[PDB]
Design a protein around this ligand. Structure first.
Ligand SMILES: *[C@@H]1O[C@H](CO)[C@@H](O[C@@H]2O[C@H](CO)[C@@H](O)[C@H](O)[C@H]2NC(C)=O)[C@H](O)[C@H]1NC(C)=O
Ligand SMILES: *[C@@H]1O[C@H](CO)[C@@H](O)[C@H](O)[C@H]1NC(C)=O
Ligand SMILES: *[C@@H]1O[C@H](CO)[C@@H](O)[C@H](O)[C@H]1NC(C)=O
Ligand SMILES: *[C@@H]1O[C@H](CO)[C@@H](O)[C@H](O)[C@H]1NC(C)=O
Ligand SMILES: *[C@@H]1O[C@H](CO)[C@@H](O)[C@H](O)[C@H]1NC(C)=O
Ligand SMILES: *[C@@H]1O[C@H](CO)[C@@H](O)[C@H](O)[C@H]1NC(C)=O
Ligand SMILES: *[C@@H]1O[C@H](CO)[C@@H](O)[C@H](O)[C@H]1NC(C)=O
Ligand SMILES: *[C@@H]1O[C@H](CO)[C@@H](O)[C@H](O)[C@H]1NC(C)=O
Ligand SMILES: *[C@@H]1O[C@H](CO)[C@@H](O)[C@H](O)[C@H]1NC(C)=O
Lengths: 49, 31, 583, 49, 49, 149
């Protein structure tokens, strides 16, 4: 959760407090795909273990 | 057999057509 | 005659060394063992046989392979062009000697696309006579004259030893000529000599090419009793043409670095197996390479029959456009909107949109269209945009972030800026809150700036919100009145009304076609649908969001869409060392 | 297949019927990376099972 | 206090662009250090900064 | 038209589906319309002079570019070399296998250049990233000692 993943911040409260929806959605999509990838990796590791 | 018949009736294994059209095919077993 | 291509059709797509790799390339190639049309320009040896002469017009597809078998440099050059007239440019190539002089200049000799190599008496031998058959004005652009001087014809009647392989492919206004030379042995057909074609010439030509022509040199010894052109009994050169196809080859390089072998990916099922497995060693066993996909036969287009032109003439140029604080809603309903005039009438300073693209506006259909036209400052033309926070234009006119539709802006200097002062154009300057995109605050109240009730009186910090525009007749660039109009193209799947007319092909059942229902570019068989469709919009969906049941706009028949026969091939093959037959 | 994945639609026939290649390629990239991620997740689950 | 309403009331700028904060949320946000650089350039240089 | 094709031809236009062979009438207009320019017109109608350049970046022997220092070749020493934009860092050697008479560029499976040719001369070169391995700190616990291997 402390990873930029390409976005200009790392917490979702400091993106919607800076940008507007039409331009903040791309940053949020970056953050969400990164976090979903990390969580899927964790789930796969848990399944194997 | 009699007992085998009681087993093939309580499982029972269109959605299949939807999967087939999208490329999600199901191969048939060798045996 | 017709023959088969054994080891022809391979060329380095992009030259890289590629030391011993099995690369997978996709470009314009010639499938192996396909029909290659033999043009045997042999001299007629009998009094009954026809004079074998081959300079016919050949249609030019997206790519063309050419092959010339040769022993005495008879075949010389090639010619292209859309129609070979004064209207369209025509390239040409001349190989009168070792020097390679070419042109692009349009010279019309449709009656005589020939070339002359006549037997000269002075030091009698096989010399070239007529390398100029051009009978028109040039009016051309490109030129190229390479002059390595070496006079050689060397007429002979022996076996055709040499062969030159060429590929003439054009794309993005560029012409690429790949070429290679090989000493062949067989005289009757193409021998089994494998090699690739190194690129030599790339030329920017910018001409639509659809036709093709060839040049032959026909003239013989003066001892022949008659016309050497009408009667000639020494020509034996032949050439082969192959229409290139979009393929996907697998090219196996070697340690040296040249393409030694190649395999198609659609020639044979075992060829596709090697294409998928990425090797030439296919062992025993079942393989799954691709799917049995049936291509659509035709392309149905379904747009409403009626051809009522939409009133777009009164939305662009009108007498008066209402000010920004109160803009009008022009609802265009149930008509045809031909955008060709909207393309012909091209005087727009700014044209932007974020939904559909202007390329596809012509071949697309809409269900609801609303036009909002008004006039703004010169610096406000950039401020009518979704998400663009307006310093003063957020009180006035905002665009939705989900907005889909195109905006048009142009200078209204000649119509809205006059010596009459034109102070009738007003706008809101400040308000206690910022408006939502498609809401207009036409109300005009007093502003209580400074936290004091200025009920009816305009004093300090009680200014009138509806301020007239500071226009001036023929002012500077940044202050001109720009007249704009926005279109809100409602793309929600509803019965499409406002769009241009295309051919309404008749309905066909049990035949999957590349049909198009108001943009629904689906390719599947059509059937009658048992389930009663909705009286509302003509669109249906399923779990996978691929349309299953629709309804035609012209006829209220419930159509059922289903992608046609799809399966999967499974090459059953033994070891390639044992055989090549598959099941 | 019924997932937007960030694109303005969810079916490949309603993106190429709206946008042009230079602007539709980004939407197609979004859709294809999303679908490839989903299919890879399915394949991993199938391998574990 | 940097009241941007007057910076919104005084709207006479041909070009107003930025890549960080959005103008919609400039009002309801706080800044630490603000540095302004004022200067003059050509007519073809305005897009160049 | 397609991007790099210019239709220099000037024909008659059969608007309204009628053959206007040689005659300019209603819906038979001349396609080649001259620009409605005016000496010192408004901002939106001034003639703008433009020129576009097609920088063909395809890997072919580079000819048109500015002059940079031609440092002498050195063998068995990986350097931050730069061959027409090829910002590679590896040792350079002579190449045994015959290179192509065409472009000075080569590639491998991993899309990282392996064999090239010099611009100024015609000697074949083999590129290989220099000595690369991996450290593996063999250590006991911190409290027992600090020496590692
Ligand atoms: C390139 O040239 C071909 C020539 O075949 C053009 O095809 C013409 O298309 C129009 C429009 O459908 C037809 O009316 C003509 O009859 C076609 N020509 C012939 C000889 O049949 C084609 O339009 C040109 N342009 C492009 C972009 O391909
Ligand atoms: C070539 O065309 C002939 C038609 O005469 C046809 O019989 C043949 O199958 C085609 N293909 C080959 C490889 O000959
Ligand atoms: C290159 O071709 C020559 C042909 O003389 C051959 O002997 C050699 O094995 C090939 N490969 C290499 C790496 O030299
Ligand atoms: C466009 O509208 C203006 C009204 O200001 C009118 O004078 C002009 O003739 C119109 N042009 C066309 C082509 O309708
Ligand atoms: C009233 O009519 C005027 C005159 O057309 C118009 O400008 C205004 O928007 C209308 N509505 C209000 C609330 O004034
Ligand atoms: C008009 O609509 C009917 C009903 O589907 C259709 O059969 C016919 O082809 C249409 N007319 C034209 C010219 O396509
Ligand atoms: C072909 O290869 C297979 C696999 O190694 C082997 O079993 C078989 O004997 C080979 N046949 C021949 C004729 O070499
Ligand atoms: C460039 O350098 C090469 C190698 O030293 C030399 O052969 C060639 O003549 C030079 N070209 C010049 C000086 O134009
Ligand atoms: C660290 O100290 C503990 C005693 O608390 C000892 O048992 C242990 O061996 C020490 N660590 C190592 C790596 O020896």
């Amino acid at each position: 959760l402390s990873s930029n993943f390409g976005a200009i911040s790392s917490v979702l409260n400091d993106i919607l407090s800076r940008l507007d929806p039409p331009e903040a959605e791309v940053q949020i999509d970056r953050l969400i795909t990164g976090r979903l990838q990390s969580l899927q990796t964790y789930v796969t590791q848990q399944l194997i273990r | 057999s009699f007992i085998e018949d009681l087993l093939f009736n309580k499982v029972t294994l269109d959605l299949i057509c939807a999967q087939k059209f999208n490329g999600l095919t199901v191969l048939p077993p060798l045996l | 005659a017709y023959t088969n291509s054994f080891t022809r059709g391979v060329y380095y797509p992009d030259k890289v060394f590629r030391s011993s790799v099995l690369h997978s390339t996709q470009d314009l190639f010639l499938p192996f063992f396909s029909n290659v049309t033999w043009f045997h320009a042999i001299h007629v040896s009998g009094t009954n046989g026809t004079k074998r002469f081959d300079n016919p017009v050949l249609p030019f597809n997206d790519g063309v392979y050419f092959a010339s078998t040769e022993k005495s440099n008879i075949i010389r050059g090639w010619i292209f062009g859309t129609t070979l007239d004064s209207k369209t440019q025509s390239l040409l190539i001349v190989n009168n000697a070792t020097n390679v002089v070419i042109k692009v200049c349009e010279f019309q000799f449709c009656n005589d696309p020939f070339l002359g190599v006549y037997y000269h008496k002075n030091n009698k031998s096989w010399m070239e006579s007529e390398f100029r058959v051009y009978s028109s004005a040039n009016n051309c652009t490109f030129e190229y004259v390479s002059q390595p001087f070496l006079m050689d014809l060397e007429g002979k009647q022996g076996n055709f030893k040499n062969l030159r392989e060429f590929v003439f492919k054009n794309i993005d206004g560029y012409f690429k000529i790949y070429s290679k030379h090989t000493p062949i042995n067989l005289v009757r057909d193409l021998p089994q000599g494998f090699s690739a074609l190194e690129p030599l010439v790339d030329l920017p030509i910018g001409i639509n090419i659809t036709r093709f022509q060839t040049l032959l040199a026909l003239h013989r010894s003066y001892l022949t009793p008659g016309d050497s052109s009408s009667g000639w009994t020494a020509g034996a050169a032949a050439y082969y043409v192959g229409y290139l196809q979009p393929r996907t080859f697998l090219l196996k390089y070697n340690e040296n670095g040249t393409i030694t072998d190649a395999v198609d990916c659609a020639l044979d099922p075992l060829s596709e197996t090697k294409c998928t497995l990425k090797s030439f060693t296919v062992e025993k066993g079942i393989y799954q390479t691709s799917n049995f996909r049936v291509q659509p036969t035709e392309s149905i287009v379904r747009f409403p029959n009626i051809t009522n032109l939409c009133p777009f003439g009164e939305v662009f140029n009108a007498t008066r456009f209402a000010s920004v604080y109160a803009w009008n809603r022009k609802r265009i309903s149930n008509c045809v909107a031909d955008y060709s005039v909207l393309y012909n009438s091209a005087s727009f300073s700014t044209f932007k949109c974020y939904g559909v693209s202007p390329t596809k506006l012509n071949d697309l259909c809409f269900t609801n269209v609303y036009a909002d036209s008004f006039v703004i400052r010169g610096d406000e033309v950039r401020q009518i945009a979704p998400g663009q926070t307006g310093k003063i234009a957020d009180y006035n006119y905002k665009l939705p972030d989900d907005f889909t539709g195109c905006v048009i802006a142009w200078n209204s200097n000649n119509l809205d800026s006059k010596v009459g002062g034109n102070y009738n154009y007003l706008y809101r300057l400040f308000r206690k809150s910022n408006l939502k995109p498609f809401e207009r605050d036409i109300s005009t109240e007093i502003y209580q700036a400074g936290s004091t009730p200025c009920n009816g009186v305009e004093g300090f910090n009680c200014y009138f919100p509806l301020q007239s525009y500071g226009f001036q007749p023929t002012n500077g660039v940044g202050y001109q009145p720009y007249r704009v109009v926005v279109l809100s193209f409602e793309l929600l799947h509803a019965p499409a009304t406002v769009c241009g007319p295309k051919k309404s092909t008749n309905l066909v059942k049990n035949k999957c076609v590349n049909f198009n229902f108001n943009g629904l570019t689906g390719t599947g068989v059509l059937t009658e649908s048992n389930k009663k469709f909705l009286p509302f919009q003509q669109f249906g969906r399923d779990i996978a969001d691929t349309t299953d049941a629709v309804r035609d706009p012209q006829t209220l028949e419930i159509l059922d869409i289903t992608p046609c026969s799809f399966g999967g091939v499974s090459v059953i093959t033994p070891g390639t060392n044992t055989s090549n037959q598959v099941a």
